[PDB]
Write an enzyme that holds these catalytic residues in place. Structure first.
Site, mmCIF file in Angstrom:
data_model
loop_
_atom_site.group_PDB
_atom_site.id
_atom_site.type_symbol
_atom_site.label_atom_id
_atom_site.label_comp_id
_atom_site.label_asym_id
_atom_site.label_seq_id
_atom_site.Cartn_x
_atom_site.Cartn_y
_atom_site.Cartn_z
ATOM 1 N N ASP A 28 -9.526 4.448 -8.426
ATOM 2 C CA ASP A 28 -8.259 3.769 -8.184
ATOM 3 C C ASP A 28 -8.531 2.355 -7.684
ATOM 4 O OD1 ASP A 28 -5.647 3.059 -7.243
ATOM 5 O OD2 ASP A 28 -5.222 5.211 -6.855
ATOM 6 N N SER B 277 1.738 7.185 -5.280
ATOM 7 C CA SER B 277 1.471 5.842 -4.771
ATOM 8 C C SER B 277 2.434 5.538 -3.621
ATOM 9 C CB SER B 277 1.372 4.832 -5.906
ATOM 10 O OG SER B 277 0.637 3.704 -5.462
ATOM 11 N N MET B 278 3.280 4.512 -3.680
ATOM 12 C CA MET B 278 4.286 4.357 -2.623
ATOM 13 C C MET B 278 5.188 5.592 -2.490
ATOM 14 S SD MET B 278 5.819 0.544 -2.856
ATOM 15 C CE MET B 278 4.825 -0.945 -2.571
ATOM 16 N N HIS C 88 -5.675 4.943 -11.228
ATOM 17 C CA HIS C 88 -4.546 5.183 -10.321
ATOM 18 C C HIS C 88 -3.505 6.159 -10.871
ATOM 19 C CE1 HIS C 88 -1.740 4.105 -7.129
ATOM 20 N NE2 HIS C 88 -0.906 3.505 -7.962
ATOM 21 N N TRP D 119 -0.250 5.599 -1.102
ATOM 22 C CA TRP D 119 -0.393 4.361 -0.368
ATOM 23 C C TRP D 119 0.777 4.218 0.591
ATOM 24 C CZ3 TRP D 119 2.596 0.143 0.637
ATOM 25 C CH2 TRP D 119 1.950 -0.910 1.279
ATOM 26 N N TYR E 292 5.775 2.155 -7.222
ATOM 27 C CA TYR E 292 6.406 0.843 -7.397
ATOM 28 C C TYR E 292 6.472 0.501 -8.878
ATOM 29 C CZ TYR E 292 7.221 -4.008 -5.610
ATOM 30 O OH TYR E 292 7.672 -5.250 -5.229
HETATM 31 CL CL LIG Z 1 -6.677 1.877 -11.284
HETATM 32 CL CL LIG Z 2 2.993 1.826 -5.532
#
Ligand SMILES: [Cl-]
Ligand SMILES: [Cl-]
Ligand code: NA
Ligand code: NA
Length: 265
Positions: free
Chosen positions: A178, A132-133, A209, A157, A59
């Protein structure tokens, strides 16, 4: 012999190096079909057709966050497309659709005589990665397209952690510290949900992250593992079984798990 085996026999050093055996070139996709923008990285001298891998940011993020994978993987014998999404604010399901659209377009370009990748791709052998996403989107892609041969998301995620339907060999890179998608509520439950596949969990000690992004300080280990996973499972290349399946037994790895990876006679 294995028709998909490419390149010299691997060593730890050759997989930890910044570059693999093949020379890499790249181009910008002129008219993206179903996603925002793309860069295609390809080997000029792989000596046979190679599989394709599509990589998606998180994102707000862009190709820069994931770019390092392009040359790293392509130099070992893959065509790699890194994308920007239609919007930086797209969610995982949309990111998955766009990732698959990028793979589709790589297949189109493989059949386009003007393209630098004309005839370079085995369109039956594909993989998915992302942050991530974009990592959640990679897992959605795998769930919905079980003929994909490998997945290797990073710091994933999704709104759901239940990926029990994934049968694609999946390596999850995780980042110990993270605070965006905490491992204990995101990457690890995702890992634990997958029961029918070859799978692995590799958590970078002390990582934020962004621990697997461009500019990370673990490119030797992370790049070795990503290349080895893609080689083992996209190319069926058992020269890579130890590198793919082993616990690195590393002080840089705070958590390692794997299942159904090594073959039992
Ligand atoms: Cl982080
Ligand atoms: Cl994300
Ligand atoms: Na699922
Ligand atoms: Na630690």
């Amino acid at each position: 012999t294995n028709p998909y085996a490419r390149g010299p026999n691997p060593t730890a050093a050759s997989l930890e190096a910044s570059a693999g055996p093949f020379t890499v070139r790249s181009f910008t996709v002129s008219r993206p079909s179903g996603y925002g923008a793309g860069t295609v990285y390809y080997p000029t001298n792989a000596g046979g057709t190679v599989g394709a891998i599509a990589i998606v940011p998180g994102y707000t993020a862009r190709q820069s966050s994931i770019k390092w994978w392009g040359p790293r993987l392509a130099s070992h014998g893959f065509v790699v497309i890194t994308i920007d999404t239609n919007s930086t604010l797209d969610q995982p399901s949309s990111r998955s659709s766009q990732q698959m659209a990028a793979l589709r377009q790589v297949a189109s370009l493989n059949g386009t005589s003007s393209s630098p990748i004309y005839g370079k791709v085995d369109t039956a052998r594909m993989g998915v990665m992302g942050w991530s996403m974009g990592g959640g989107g990679s897992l959605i892609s795998a769930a919905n397209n079980p003929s994909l041969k490998a997945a290797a998301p990073q710091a994933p995620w999704d709104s759901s952690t239940n990926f029990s339907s994934v049968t694609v060999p999946t390596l999850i890179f995780a980042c110990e510290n993270d605070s965006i998608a905490p491992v204990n509520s995101s990457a690890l439950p995702i890992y634990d949900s997958m029961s029918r596949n070859a799978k692995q969990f590799l958590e970078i000690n002390g990582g934020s992250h962004s621990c697997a992004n461009s500019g990370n300080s673990n490119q030797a280990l992370i790049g070795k593992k990503g290349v080895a996973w893609m080689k083992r499972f996209m190319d069926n290349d058992t020269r890579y079984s130890t590198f793919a399946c082993e616990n690195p037994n590393s002080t840089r790895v705070s958590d390692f798990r794997t299942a159904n990876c090594s073959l039992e006679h």
